[PDB]
């Protein structure tokens, strides 16, 4: 990367906001995944959207790849600079604007995390529900199409993103639904917002997101329920969803995951396949949700172990399951699967996955958003054992292909990044791949917007 180019970047954002130091580049060359760190050639922190546009235009016209970088919590290698280039760290734009409580909407810049937003919203009666375990950038969550434990009731990012401000690869500024607009529904033109949700930084740079807010629940009850088998836990889940109980949270942990979270968070749940449950409503709405849910679990479920601080540590432990699993083998890294299947096929694929981890020499923990038909197999990898890392990728492929055989998808929320590109090709077939690539080509003709990812 030439000295004239660096000085051009510094002219846009300021000398302190451009770095070519190896240490700073290495810190931005990886996320939380096991994907080998590939450092960008520079890191740049734009201070406003005009600077984002001007950095993108500079890179694009000089043939330099651009890698958007939020909080670096992705798990599929999205920020790895496989072709070098300029990593654009967006987190200095960190303002919340246009809070419209009467309309249930708010606009956030990329440095705003979910915690920051919900802190800003205390005593408003509103909250933002989509809750990845990591303290992630909300614009990064829009870019990956994130979900979380609350999505079974309150929806994913795709359900809760109303508008996006996007700097296209050549620097043009697009407001996907129109500048300043926010509304409940529209048939106006083609829906551009949905195209950029889940685009993983390959179609442009999200510089603000307009989010749907929700009313805080009148009352909340959380509980855990221990089961004699994985089959019993997932059968309960399927029957709870088919009975149309509007559960707020329904999270599965197998016995390996439960033990790991016990040891990492000083919980003391019985070591067993377990459901973490949460219910929202009034006292009366809660009583019959609990009535009907506990009748279904009583598939051999234990009496509910009920859980302010007490449910807070329960869901903090769930949110840290990734780190709980890594703590089972210090020094190792991890890869997560993320399949999502039609709910009636969930029992057979979790039970099969449990059996396959057991028959394997790999250490694997199972956790996830089974209310969506989605779950994660967290597989540990020694960063120096190439042969374990191949057993893990092979396990991951086979699980992905089994989900596709059942009519499902290879990723419910994490995205494709570097690790699921071949699965995506199988998932949508030749016409789907070409159509996706034609969209990529019209927005990013030179292929400089996060190259090597998704397609
Ligand atoms: C402990 C833990 C728990 C997690 N739990 C969940 C979970 O429940 N659900 C879930 O969905 N994910 C989960 N994740 C994954 C991760 O938090 C999400 O994928 C999150 O949305 C990533 O946001 P980020 O800004 O940290 O991404 P980054 O790693 O910074 O980037 C991710 C990808 O998005 C692109 N990108 C980032 N910001 C932008 C932007 N502003 N514009 C355009 N492209 C951009 C990057 O180029 C990259 O390809 C978890 C991760 C961890 C470590
Ligand atoms: C990062 C994999 C774990 C995850 O997504 C979760 O905690 O739900
Ligand atoms: Mn998850």
Short mmCIF file of C-alpha atoms and ligand atoms in Angstrom, two decimals:
data_model
loop_
_atom_site.label_atom_id
_atom_site.label_comp_id
_atom_site.label_asym_id
_atom_site.label_seq_id
_atom_site.Cartn_x
_atom_site.Cartn_y
_atom_site.Cartn_z
CA UNK A 1 0.00 0.00 0.00
CA UNK A 2 1.76 3.16 -1.27
CA UNK A 3 2.75 6.21 0.75
CA UNK A 4 0.77 8.53 -1.53
CA UNK A 5 -2.34 6.45 -0.84
CA UNK A 6 -1.82 6.58 2.95
CA UNK A 7 -1.45 10.34 2.89
CA UNK A 8 -4.67 10.56 0.87
CA UNK A 9 -6.48 8.57 3.57
CA UNK A 10 -5.05 10.84 6.27
CA UNK A 11 -6.27 13.87 4.32
CA UNK A 12 -9.86 12.58 4.69
CA UNK A 13 -10.02 11.35 8.29
CA UNK A 14 -7.02 12.88 10.01
CA UNK A 15 -3.59 11.53 10.82
CA UNK A 16 -4.58 9.92 14.18
CA UNK A 17 -7.39 7.98 12.44
CA UNK A 18 -5.19 6.03 9.96
CA UNK A 19 -2.86 3.26 11.04
CA UNK A 20 -0.46 1.02 9.16
CA UNK A 21 1.15 -0.37 12.34
CA UNK A 22 1.37 -4.16 12.31
CA UNK A 23 -0.10 -4.57 15.80
CA UNK A 24 -3.13 -2.40 15.01
CA UNK A 25 -3.70 -4.23 11.72
CA UNK A 26 -3.43 -7.65 13.38
CA UNK A 27 -6.06 -6.60 15.94
CA UNK A 28 -8.44 -5.89 13.04
CA UNK A 29 -7.54 -8.95 10.96
CA UNK A 30 -9.70 -11.47 12.79
CA UNK A 31 -12.98 -11.82 14.60
CA UNK A 32 -14.05 -14.35 17.21
CA UNK A 33 -13.90 -17.28 14.73
CA UNK A 34 -11.10 -19.82 14.30
CA UNK A 35 -10.40 -18.33 10.85
CA UNK A 36 -6.70 -17.44 10.64
CA UNK A 37 -6.03 -13.75 11.12
CA UNK A 38 -5.36 -11.95 7.84
CA UNK A 39 -4.36 -8.38 8.59
CA UNK A 40 -5.56 -5.48 6.45
CA UNK A 41 -2.92 -3.20 5.01
CA UNK A 42 -4.32 -0.24 6.96
CA UNK A 43 -7.05 0.59 9.46
CA UNK A 44 -9.07 3.80 9.10
CA UNK A 45 -11.60 5.33 11.54
CA UNK A 46 -13.92 7.73 9.66
CA UNK A 47 -15.50 10.35 11.91
CA UNK A 48 -18.69 11.05 9.92
CA UNK A 49 -20.54 9.79 6.86
CA UNK A 50 -18.88 12.28 4.49
CA UNK A 51 -15.54 10.75 5.48
CA UNK A 52 -16.90 7.21 4.98
CA UNK A 53 -17.97 8.19 1.47
CA UNK A 54 -14.62 9.80 0.69
CA UNK A 55 -12.58 6.85 2.04
CA UNK A 56 -14.70 4.41 0.05
CA UNK A 57 -14.32 6.47 -3.13
CA UNK A 58 -10.55 6.67 -2.62
CA UNK A 59 -10.19 2.92 -2.11
CA UNK A 60 -12.62 1.94 -4.84
CA UNK A 61 -11.00 4.05 -7.56
CA UNK A 62 -7.48 2.91 -6.60
CA UNK A 63 -8.44 -0.77 -6.69
CA UNK A 64 -7.96 -1.24 -2.93
CA UNK A 65 -10.30 -3.65 -1.07
CA UNK A 66 -12.55 -2.26 1.66
CA UNK A 67 -13.41 -4.31 4.75
CA UNK A 68 -16.14 -2.82 7.00
CA UNK A 69 -15.39 -3.47 10.67
CA UNK A 70 -17.87 -3.08 13.50
CA UNK A 71 -17.10 -4.64 16.87
CA UNK A 72 -15.32 -7.68 15.43
CA UNK A 73 -17.55 -10.24 17.16
CA UNK A 74 -18.53 -12.10 14.00
CA UNK A 75 -17.91 -15.81 13.89
CA UNK A 76 -17.47 -16.61 10.27
CA UNK A 77 -14.42 -14.55 9.25
CA UNK A 78 -16.22 -11.57 7.82
CA UNK A 79 -13.49 -9.09 8.74
CA UNK A 80 -10.53 -11.24 7.62
CA UNK A 81 -8.60 -9.28 4.98
CA UNK A 82 -8.12 -12.20 2.60
CA UNK A 83 -6.98 -9.82 -0.17
CA UNK A 84 -5.45 -7.12 2.04
CA UNK A 85 -6.85 -3.63 1.73
CA UNK A 86 -8.27 -1.01 4.05
CA UNK A 87 -10.22 -2.00 7.16
CA UNK A 88 -12.78 0.71 7.92
CA UNK A 89 -13.52 0.70 11.66
CA UNK A 90 -16.87 2.46 11.99
CA UNK A 91 -17.22 2.66 15.74
CA UNK A 92 -16.27 6.31 16.23
CA UNK A 93 -19.68 7.23 14.75
CA UNK A 94 -21.55 6.34 17.93
CA UNK A 95 -24.57 8.65 18.18
CA UNK A 96 -28.22 7.74 18.76
CA UNK A 97 -30.60 10.05 16.88
CA UNK A 98 -34.22 10.54 15.89
CA UNK A 99 -35.59 8.71 18.92
CA UNK A 100 -39.31 8.62 18.13
CA UNK A 101 -40.94 6.92 21.12
CA UNK A 102 -44.47 7.66 19.83
CA UNK A 103 -43.60 5.84 16.57
CA UNK A 104 -41.51 3.07 18.20
CA UNK A 105 -38.37 3.88 16.20
CA UNK A 106 -34.79 5.12 16.59
CA UNK A 107 -31.74 5.75 14.37
CA UNK A 108 -28.30 4.46 15.44
CA UNK A 109 -24.76 4.87 14.11
CA UNK A 110 -22.30 1.93 13.96
CA UNK A 111 -20.58 2.52 17.31
CA UNK A 112 -23.89 2.07 19.16
CA UNK A 113 -24.22 -1.37 20.74
CA UNK A 114 -27.44 -2.97 21.94
CA UNK A 115 -26.43 -2.27 25.57
CA UNK A 116 -25.79 1.39 24.81
CA UNK A 117 -29.18 1.70 23.10
CA UNK A 118 -31.15 -0.02 25.84
CA UNK A 119 -29.32 2.04 28.48
CA UNK A 120 -30.31 5.17 26.58
CA UNK A 121 -33.88 3.85 26.56
CA UNK A 122 -34.32 3.20 30.29
CA UNK A 123 -37.45 4.84 31.73
CA UNK A 124 -38.83 5.20 28.19
CA UNK A 125 -40.92 2.03 28.41
CA UNK A 126 -39.31 0.82 25.18
CA UNK A 127 -36.48 -1.57 24.38
CA UNK A 128 -34.69 -3.13 21.45
CA UNK A 129 -35.08 -6.93 21.61
CA UNK A 130 -32.63 -8.57 19.18
CA UNK A 131 -29.96 -9.94 21.54
CA UNK A 132 -26.79 -11.65 20.32
CA UNK A 133 -24.67 -12.81 23.22
CA UNK A 134 -21.85 -10.43 22.27
CA UNK A 135 -21.91 -6.67 22.84
CA UNK A 136 -22.10 -6.06 19.11
CA UNK A 137 -22.53 -3.02 16.89
CA UNK A 138 -26.20 -2.68 15.89
CA UNK A 139 -25.18 -1.79 12.34
CA UNK A 140 -22.94 -4.88 12.33
CA UNK A 141 -25.97 -6.85 13.46
CA UNK A 142 -27.91 -5.43 10.50
CA UNK A 143 -25.02 -6.37 8.19
CA UNK A 144 -24.95 -10.00 9.38
CA UNK A 145 -28.73 -10.45 9.68
CA UNK A 146 -28.39 -11.30 13.38
CA UNK A 147 -30.94 -13.00 15.63
CA UNK A 148 -30.90 -13.82 19.33
CA UNK A 149 -32.83 -15.45 22.14
CA UNK A 150 -35.67 -12.91 21.88
CA UNK A 151 -36.27 -13.45 18.16
CA UNK A 152 -38.79 -16.28 18.60
CA UNK A 153 -41.22 -13.60 19.85
CA UNK A 154 -39.88 -10.23 18.73
CA UNK A 155 -38.21 -11.08 15.39
CA UNK A 156 -34.73 -10.95 13.86
CA UNK A 157 -32.80 -7.95 12.52
CA UNK A 158 -34.63 -8.50 9.23
CA UNK A 159 -37.92 -8.05 11.09
CA UNK A 160 -36.76 -5.00 13.04
CA UNK A 161 -34.71 -2.97 10.53
CA UNK A 162 -36.95 -0.26 9.03
CA UNK A 163 -34.35 1.72 7.06
CA UNK A 164 -30.61 1.76 6.39
CA UNK A 165 -28.14 4.46 5.43
CA UNK A 166 -25.55 2.84 3.19
CA UNK A 167 -22.39 4.19 1.60
CA UNK A 168 -22.14 2.24 -1.64
CA UNK A 169 -18.70 0.98 -2.74
CA UNK A 170 -18.02 3.98 -4.97
CA UNK A 171 -19.03 6.43 -2.21
CA UNK A 172 -22.63 7.26 -3.14
CA UNK A 173 -25.03 7.63 -0.20
CA UNK A 174 -28.18 5.49 -0.28
CA UNK A 175 -31.07 5.60 2.18
CA UNK A 176 -32.63 2.26 1.39
CA UNK A 177 -36.22 3.30 2.21
CA UNK A 178 -35.67 7.04 1.67
CA UNK A 179 -33.95 9.64 3.83
CA UNK A 180 -35.59 10.05 7.19
CA UNK A 181 -38.45 7.64 6.47
CA UNK A 182 -39.91 5.24 8.99
CA UNK A 183 -43.21 3.41 8.73
CA UNK A 184 -44.81 0.05 9.40
CA UNK A 185 -45.21 -1.22 5.82
CA UNK A 186 -44.60 -0.19 2.24
CA UNK A 187 -45.12 -1.47 -1.30
CA UNK A 188 -43.18 1.45 -2.81
CA UNK A 189 -40.78 0.12 -5.42
CA UNK A 190 -38.42 -2.74 -4.64
CA UNK A 191 -37.59 -3.25 -1.00
CA UNK A 192 -33.93 -2.26 -0.86
CA UNK A 193 -33.68 -2.46 2.94
CA UNK A 194 -34.00 -6.25 2.93
CA UNK A 195 -31.21 -6.59 0.37
CA UNK A 196 -28.66 -4.89 2.59
CA UNK A 197 -29.68 -6.71 5.78
CA UNK A 198 -27.46 -9.79 5.82
CA UNK A 199 -25.09 -8.47 3.14
CA UNK A 200 -22.06 -8.81 5.47
CA UNK A 201 -20.26 -5.74 4.11
CA UNK A 202 -20.12 -7.05 0.53
CA UNK A 203 -22.66 -4.56 -0.91
CA UNK A 204 -21.79 -1.35 0.93
CA UNK A 205 -21.11 0.21 4.32
CA UNK A 206 -24.02 0.64 6.72
CA UNK A 207 -23.57 4.00 8.42
CA UNK A 208 -26.88 4.12 10.24
CA UNK A 209 -29.77 1.78 10.95
CA UNK A 210 -33.38 2.74 11.72
CA UNK A 211 -34.69 0.21 14.23
CA UNK A 212 -38.12 -0.85 15.41
CA UNK A 213 -38.54 -0.51 19.18
CA UNK A 214 -40.94 -2.55 21.28
CA UNK A 215 -42.89 -1.92 24.50
CA UNK A 216 -41.31 -3.34 27.63
CA UNK A 217 -43.28 -6.37 28.88
CA UNK A 218 -45.75 -5.72 31.69
CA UNK A 219 -44.38 -8.68 33.65
CA UNK A 220 -41.62 -11.23 33.09
CA UNK A 221 -41.01 -14.75 34.40
CA UNK A 222 -37.95 -16.89 33.60
CA UNK A 223 -37.40 -20.54 34.43
CA UNK A 224 -35.25 -23.54 33.64
CA UNK A 225 -36.47 -27.07 32.93
CA UNK A 226 -34.33 -30.21 32.97
CA UNK A 227 -35.09 -33.18 30.73
CA UNK A 228 -34.04 -36.85 30.65
CA UNK A 229 -32.89 -36.63 27.03
CA UNK A 230 -32.29 -34.30 24.12
CA UNK A 231 -35.24 -35.94 22.36
CA UNK A 232 -37.52 -35.03 25.26
CA UNK A 233 -36.35 -31.40 25.34
CA UNK A 234 -36.72 -30.81 21.61
CA UNK A 235 -40.05 -32.64 21.43
CA UNK A 236 -41.30 -30.27 24.14
CA UNK A 237 -40.03 -27.33 22.11
CA UNK A 238 -41.81 -28.45 18.94
CA UNK A 239 -45.05 -29.05 20.83
CA UNK A 240 -44.83 -25.68 22.60
CA UNK A 241 -44.52 -23.97 19.21
CA UNK A 242 -47.29 -26.06 17.64
CA UNK A 243 -49.54 -25.19 20.61
CA UNK A 244 -48.90 -21.52 19.72
CA UNK A 245 -47.69 -20.52 23.18
CA UNK A 246 -46.18 -17.03 22.61
CA UNK A 247 -43.03 -17.77 24.63
CA UNK A 248 -40.62 -14.85 24.80
CA UNK A 249 -37.48 -17.02 25.00
CA UNK A 250 -36.94 -20.76 24.54
CA UNK A 251 -33.28 -21.76 24.56
CA UNK A 252 -31.83 -25.27 24.48
CA UNK A 253 -28.62 -26.38 26.18
CA UNK A 254 -27.42 -29.96 26.06
CA UNK A 255 -25.77 -31.53 29.11
CA UNK A 256 -22.28 -30.62 27.91
CA UNK A 257 -23.31 -26.98 27.45
CA UNK A 258 -25.17 -26.87 30.78
CA UNK A 259 -22.10 -28.14 32.64
CA UNK A 260 -19.85 -25.67 30.82
CA UNK A 261 -22.12 -22.73 31.74
CA UNK A 262 -22.33 -23.95 35.34
CA UNK A 263 -18.55 -23.84 35.60
CA UNK A 264 -18.15 -20.53 33.77
CA UNK A 265 -20.93 -18.54 35.47
CA UNK A 266 -21.29 -20.28 38.85
CA UNK A 267 -24.80 -21.38 38.01
CA UNK A 268 -25.81 -24.68 39.61
CA UNK A 269 -28.44 -26.11 37.28
CA UNK A 270 -28.75 -29.91 37.09
CA UNK A 271 -26.43 -31.24 34.39
CA UNK A 272 -28.99 -32.37 31.82
CA UNK A 273 -30.48 -31.25 28.50
CA UNK A 274 -32.25 -28.10 29.56
CA UNK A 275 -34.63 -25.43 28.33
CA UNK A 276 -34.18 -21.84 29.49
CA UNK A 277 -37.63 -20.26 29.20
CA UNK A 278 -39.02 -16.76 29.50
CA UNK A 279 -42.62 -15.53 29.41
CA UNK A 280 -43.93 -12.00 28.89
CA UNK A 281 -47.39 -10.70 29.64
CA UNK A 282 -49.77 -9.66 32.35
CA UNK A 283 -50.19 -11.78 35.48
CA UNK A 284 -53.15 -13.58 33.90
CA UNK A 285 -51.60 -14.02 30.47
CA UNK A 286 -48.52 -15.42 32.23
CA UNK A 287 -50.51 -17.89 34.33
CA UNK A 288 -52.02 -19.72 31.42
CA UNK A 289 -48.89 -19.54 29.28
CA UNK A 290 -47.13 -21.24 32.20
CA UNK A 291 -50.07 -23.64 32.65
CA UNK A 292 -49.98 -24.79 29.02
CA UNK A 293 -46.19 -24.80 28.74
CA UNK A 294 -45.61 -26.75 31.89
CA UNK A 295 -48.26 -29.31 30.86
CA UNK A 296 -46.33 -29.98 27.63
CA UNK A 297 -42.95 -30.20 29.34
CA UNK A 298 -44.37 -32.58 31.96
CA UNK A 299 -42.11 -35.18 27.99
CA UNK A 300 -40.47 -35.73 31.36
CA UNK A 301 -39.51 -32.14 32.12
CA UNK A 302 -38.70 -31.19 35.69
CA UNK A 303 -40.81 -28.78 37.65
CA UNK A 304 -39.78 -25.29 36.58
CA UNK A 305 -36.85 -23.84 38.50
CA UNK A 306 -37.92 -20.20 38.61
CA UNK A 307 -35.72 -17.13 38.29
CA UNK A 308 -34.24 -9.10 38.80
CA UNK A 309 -30.64 -10.19 39.43
CA UNK A 310 -31.68 -13.84 39.32
CA UNK A 311 -32.91 -13.95 35.72
CA UNK A 312 -30.17 -11.49 34.78
CA UNK A 313 -27.45 -13.98 35.69
CA UNK A 314 -29.39 -16.75 33.96
CA UNK A 315 -29.42 -14.94 30.62
CA UNK A 316 -25.90 -13.57 31.12
CA UNK A 317 -24.77 -17.20 31.43
CA UNK A 318 -26.64 -18.11 28.24
CA UNK A 319 -25.20 -15.08 26.43
CA UNK A 320 -21.69 -16.22 27.43
CA UNK A 321 -22.16 -19.85 26.31
CA UNK A 322 -19.55 -19.34 23.58
CA UNK A 323 -16.93 -18.42 26.19
CA UNK A 324 -18.15 -21.15 28.55
CA UNK A 325 -17.50 -23.69 25.79
CA UNK A 326 -14.05 -22.31 25.02
CA UNK A 327 -13.21 -22.54 28.74
CA UNK A 328 -13.57 -26.35 28.59
CA UNK A 329 -10.19 -26.47 26.81
CA UNK A 330 -8.08 -23.35 27.45
CA UNK A 331 -6.00 -22.31 24.46
CA UNK A 332 -8.44 -23.70 21.91
CA UNK A 333 -10.50 -21.79 19.37
CA UNK A 334 -14.02 -22.64 18.28
CA UNK A 335 -16.26 -23.00 15.24
CA UNK A 336 -20.04 -22.72 15.47
CA UNK A 337 -22.56 -24.33 13.20
CA UNK A 338 -25.85 -22.51 12.71
CA UNK A 339 -28.34 -24.61 10.75
CA UNK A 340 -32.04 -23.77 10.73
CA UNK A 341 -34.58 -26.42 9.70
CA UNK A 342 -38.38 -26.74 9.47
CA UNK A 343 -39.40 -27.13 13.10
CA UNK A 344 -40.89 -30.60 12.66
CA UNK A 345 -37.43 -31.85 11.55
CA UNK A 346 -35.60 -30.25 14.48
CA UNK A 347 -35.85 -33.32 16.78
CA UNK A 348 -34.21 -35.63 14.32
CA UNK A 349 -31.32 -33.31 13.44
CA UNK A 350 -30.46 -32.32 17.06
CA UNK A 351 -30.64 -35.91 18.23
CA UNK A 352 -28.48 -36.98 15.28
CA UNK A 353 -26.02 -34.16 16.01
CA UNK A 354 -25.79 -35.20 19.66
CA UNK A 355 -25.17 -38.82 18.61
CA UNK A 356 -22.52 -37.71 16.11
CA UNK A 357 -20.63 -35.55 18.61
CA UNK A 358 -20.71 -38.48 21.04
CA UNK A 359 -19.36 -40.95 18.46
CA UNK A 360 -16.69 -38.36 17.59
CA UNK A 361 -13.36 -37.48 19.18
CA UNK A 362 -14.30 -33.79 19.04
CA UNK A 363 -15.43 -31.70 21.98
CA UNK A 364 -18.79 -30.18 21.09
CA UNK A 365 -21.45 -28.30 23.01
CA UNK A 366 -25.00 -27.69 21.74
CA UNK A 367 -27.00 -24.53 22.45
CA UNK A 368 -29.46 -22.45 20.57
CA UNK A 369 -32.65 -20.78 19.45
CA UNK A 370 -34.72 -23.90 19.03
CA UNK A 371 -37.92 -21.83 18.97
CA UNK A 372 -36.78 -20.84 15.46
CA UNK A 373 -35.76 -24.36 14.49
CA UNK A 374 -32.16 -23.16 14.88
CA UNK A 375 -29.21 -24.36 16.98
CA UNK A 376 -25.44 -24.11 17.32
CA UNK A 377 -22.92 -26.92 17.61
CA UNK A 378 -19.87 -25.25 19.17
CA UNK A 379 -16.81 -27.30 18.17
CA UNK A 380 -13.46 -26.71 19.87
CA UNK A 381 -10.24 -26.70 17.84
CA UNK A 382 -6.62 -26.77 18.96
CA UNK A 383 -5.05 -23.88 16.96
CA UNK A 384 -2.01 -26.09 16.21
CA UNK A 385 -3.68 -29.45 15.38
CA UNK A 386 -4.42 -29.33 11.64
CA UNK A 387 -6.06 -32.74 11.73
CA UNK A 388 -8.62 -31.85 14.42
CA UNK A 389 -9.36 -28.67 12.48
CA UNK A 390 -10.11 -30.84 9.47
CA UNK A 391 -12.36 -33.15 11.49
CA UNK A 392 -14.22 -30.05 12.68
CA UNK A 393 -14.71 -28.59 9.20
CA UNK A 394 -15.82 -32.01 7.94
CA UNK A 395 -18.27 -32.32 10.83
CA UNK A 396 -19.53 -28.79 10.04
CA UNK A 397 -20.02 -29.58 6.31
CA UNK A 398 -21.90 -32.79 7.07
CA UNK A 399 -24.23 -31.11 9.54
CA UNK A 400 -24.84 -28.29 7.06
CA UNK A 401 -25.61 -30.75 4.27
CA UNK A 402 -27.97 -32.72 6.52
CA UNK A 403 -29.88 -29.50 7.25
CA UNK A 404 -30.10 -28.73 3.53
CA UNK A 405 -31.39 -32.27 2.92
CA UNK A 406 -34.23 -31.46 5.36
CA UNK A 407 -35.29 -28.32 3.47
CA UNK A 408 -33.48 -25.97 5.85
CA UNK A 409 -30.69 -23.40 5.62
CA UNK A 410 -27.01 -23.62 6.50
CA UNK A 411 -27.13 -20.43 8.60
CA UNK A 412 -30.01 -19.03 10.63
CA UNK A 413 -28.20 -15.88 11.78
CA UNK A 414 -24.37 -15.90 11.74
CA UNK A 415 -23.94 -15.57 7.99
CA UNK A 416 -21.66 -17.11 5.40
CA UNK A 417 -18.38 -15.19 5.61
CA UNK A 418 -15.51 -17.49 4.74
CA UNK A 419 -16.75 -20.78 6.03
CA UNK A 420 -20.12 -21.52 4.43
CA UNK A 421 -19.55 -20.40 0.83
CA UNK A 422 -19.79 -23.90 -0.61
CA UNK A 423 -22.92 -24.70 1.43
CA UNK A 424 -24.61 -21.54 0.11
CA UNK A 425 -23.98 -22.70 -3.46
CA UNK A 426 -25.74 -25.98 -2.66
CA UNK A 427 -28.54 -24.19 -0.78
CA UNK A 428 -29.73 -21.88 -3.58
CA UNK A 429 -28.39 -23.62 -6.70
CA UNK A 430 -26.98 -22.18 -9.91
CA UNK A 431 -29.71 -19.65 -10.66
CA UNK A 432 -29.72 -18.42 -7.07
CA UNK A 433 -25.94 -18.04 -7.05
CA UNK A 434 -25.88 -16.18 -10.37
CA UNK A 435 -28.70 -13.87 -9.29
CA UNK A 436 -26.91 -13.06 -6.04
CA UNK A 437 -23.72 -12.43 -7.96
CA UNK A 438 -25.47 -10.15 -10.44
CA UNK A 439 -26.68 -8.02 -7.51
CA UNK A 440 -23.15 -7.96 -6.06
CA UNK A 441 -21.78 -6.91 -9.44
CA UNK A 442 -24.14 -4.01 -9.97
CA UNK A 443 -23.44 -2.55 -6.52
CA UNK A 444 -19.70 -3.45 -6.47
CA UNK A 445 -18.50 -3.73 -10.10
CA UNK A 446 -14.82 -3.91 -9.19
CA UNK A 447 -15.33 -6.58 -6.51
CA UNK A 448 -13.59 -4.49 -3.85
CA UNK A 449 -16.35 -4.55 -1.20
CA UNK A 450 -15.08 -7.19 1.28
CA UNK A 451 -13.81 -9.66 -1.35
CA UNK A 452 -13.76 -13.40 -0.77
CA UNK A 453 -16.87 -13.43 1.45
CA UNK A 454 -20.35 -14.93 0.91
CA UNK A 455 -20.00 -15.54 -2.84
C1 LIG B 1 -20.20 -14.68 22.45
C2 LIG B 1 -20.88 -14.39 21.14
C3 LIG B 1 -22.25 -14.58 21.02
C4 LIG B 1 -22.91 -14.34 19.81
N1 LIG B 1 -24.27 -14.53 19.74
C5 LIG B 1 -24.88 -14.28 18.59
C6 LIG B 1 -26.31 -14.49 18.51
O1 LIG B 1 -27.04 -14.89 19.42
N2 LIG B 1 -26.85 -14.18 17.28
C7 LIG B 1 -26.16 -13.75 16.17
O2 LIG B 1 -26.81 -13.50 15.14
N3 LIG B 1 -24.81 -13.55 16.24
C8 LIG B 1 -24.20 -13.82 17.40
N4 LIG B 1 -22.84 -13.61 17.50
C9 LIG B 1 -22.09 -13.20 16.29
C10 LIG B 1 -21.88 -11.70 16.17
O3 LIG B 1 -22.00 -11.05 17.43
C11 LIG B 1 -22.93 -11.11 15.22
O4 LIG B 1 -22.76 -11.74 13.95
C12 LIG B 1 -22.85 -9.59 15.09
O5 LIG B 1 -23.95 -9.16 14.28
C13 LIG B 1 -21.54 -9.13 14.48
O6 LIG B 1 -21.43 -7.70 14.60
P1 LIG B 1 -20.02 -7.00 14.60
O7 LIG B 1 -20.12 -5.50 14.36
O8 LIG B 1 -19.26 -7.43 15.86
O9 LIG B 1 -19.36 -7.71 13.34
P2 LIG B 1 -17.92 -7.72 12.67
O10 LIG B 1 -17.20 -9.00 13.06
O11 LIG B 1 -17.24 -6.44 12.92
O12 LIG B 1 -18.36 -7.83 11.15
C14 LIG B 1 -19.21 -8.91 10.71
C15 LIG B 1 -19.44 -8.82 9.22
O13 LIG B 1 -20.31 -7.70 8.94
C16 LIG B 1 -19.62 -6.71 8.21
N5 LIG B 1 -19.95 -5.42 8.79
C17 LIG B 1 -19.79 -5.01 10.09
N6 LIG B 1 -20.23 -3.79 10.32
C18 LIG B 1 -20.72 -3.38 9.08
C19 LIG B 1 -21.30 -2.18 8.65
N7 LIG B 1 -21.53 -1.13 9.44
N8 LIG B 1 -21.66 -2.09 7.34
C20 LIG B 1 -21.44 -3.15 6.55
N9 LIG B 1 -20.89 -4.32 6.85
C21 LIG B 1 -20.55 -4.38 8.14
C22 LIG B 1 -18.13 -7.06 8.26
O14 LIG B 1 -17.46 -6.63 7.08
C23 LIG B 1 -18.18 -8.59 8.38
O15 LIG B 1 -18.30 -9.22 7.11
C24 LIG B 1 -22.16 -13.88 18.71
C25 LIG B 1 -20.79 -13.69 18.83
C26 LIG B 1 -20.14 -13.95 20.03
C27 LIG B 1 -18.65 -13.75 20.12
C1 LIG B 2 -21.24 -17.49 18.64
C2 LIG B 2 -22.05 -18.78 18.63
C3 LIG B 2 -23.00 -18.75 19.83
C4 LIG B 2 -24.28 -17.95 19.58
O1 LIG B 2 -24.61 -17.47 18.54
C5 LIG B 2 -25.21 -17.80 20.76
O2 LIG B 2 -24.76 -17.58 21.92
O3 LIG B 2 -26.44 -17.89 20.53
MN1 LIG B 3 -27.11 -17.48 18.50
#
